[PDB]
């Protein structure tokens with residue numbers, strides 16, 4: 001698809017058996033989601049943005065689907081004010097900026 | 100251009116006759132630059148991100164070139180960790196997301 005930027009680029013993702021809404025975020029290195037359970041190992045991480053840092057749990061090798069597009073990657077979980085899909089997964093679905 | 104997302108989508112901008120580096124950021128409604136001088140009067144704004152909120156100065160109708168593409172619009176100035184070009188200007192230069 002070609003996604004306009006007149007509005008926030010929100011999509012539905014499928015992760016950990018749940019459907020969630022998230023922002024396609026080229027300014028985010030990493031994918032960060034609000035609190036949720038995920039299986040497998042994790043390690044603590046601090047990530048920083050406008051306003052400072054938050055502590056998150058880093059889960060690796062997590063399957064996700066974004067717009068029919070399957071991928072696998074790292075998902076950070078913690079008290080983000082909004083769910084963001086970062087570059088680590090945007091690359092896997094072949095997402096580019098165009099102008 | 101078509102810009103992939105394996106690295107940060109950093110581009111050169113020009114504002115007030117000076118070159119700066121900034122991130123093309125589809126997750127940002129607005130454009131926020133690190134401390135700098137701009138002309139005219141400013142208005143207050145609070146913008147929120149991953150770690151909370153910051154206060155910025157809002158300047159309107161500012162000419163800014165992004166990857167050579169000419170825009171004139173609102174620029175917020177304050178203690179952001181990185182210069183970000185948000186959707187207010189990405190739409191002026193005809194930017195879309197594609198996959």
Ligand SMILES: CNc1nc2ccc(S(=O)(=O)N(CC(C)C)C[C@@H](O)[C@H](Cc3ccccc3)NC(=O)O[C@H]3CO[C@H]4OC[C@H](OCCC(F)(F)F)[C@H]43)cc2o1
Nearest residue numbers: 027028029030048049050126127128129146147148180181
């Ligand atoms: C109302 N209008 C309004 N206009 C706005 C304009 C902007 C913002 S915004 O910036 O809050 N943000 C909103 C979004 C999160 C919904 C945009 C987002 O793309 C942000 C951009 C950025 C990139 C780099 C640093 C800081 C911010 N990315 C981000 O947070 O990424 C995190 C997860 O991945 C890492 O990589 C990048 C960053 O690294 C942190 C490194 C350090 F710790 F800062 F050094 C880490 C809100 C605005 O509100």
Ligand SMILES: [Cl-]
Nearest residue numbers: 072073074088
């Ligand atoms: Cl990853």
Ligand SMILES: [Cl-]
Nearest residue numbers: 091094103104
């Ligand atoms: Cl590619």
Ligand SMILES: [Cl-]
Nearest residue numbers: 172173187188
């Ligand atoms: Cl604007």
